[PDB]
Design a protein around this ligand. Sequence first.
Ligand SMILES: O=C1NC(=O)N2[C@@H]1CS[C@@H]2c1ccc(Cl)c(Cl)c1
Length: 133
Amino acid sequence: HMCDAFVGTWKLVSSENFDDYMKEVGVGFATRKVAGMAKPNMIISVNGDVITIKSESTFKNTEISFILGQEFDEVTADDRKVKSTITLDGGVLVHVQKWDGKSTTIKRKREDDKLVVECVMKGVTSTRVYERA
Ligand SMILES: O=C1NC(=O)N2[C@@H]1CS[C@@H]2c1ccc(Cl)c(Cl)c1
């Protein structure tokens, strides 16, 4: 029952500062433009100890499956090859990606009827809000 309130199909409804987050990450111009247009659906499911988070969009589709606290390989939508670890901290999913000596953290939280995704690269934060699809 760990992540019950995250499970479901979610649609992006707002974004703030994502272009500046992507710049800080190192994403190039053309990818930022096309990635910034996308309105993804995020599909979260749980089977036993395995959590799956899928993103379906016109830009890229991504999918990760993982066990909390257990590092895995991830290919991001912008084609970084990163080493990821996801934990639950006080009801918040905390996703840390490491690559080329860099790090970025993505937090996913339930707030009212929304799922809020906060992405931080150094001093730059983007907030992306999802509602049930
Ligand atoms: O809303 C989201 N759901 C995800 O998996 N996303 C966004 C924020 S962080 C990650 C992403 C997507 C595209 C690019 Cl280009 C980058 Cl750098 C990061």
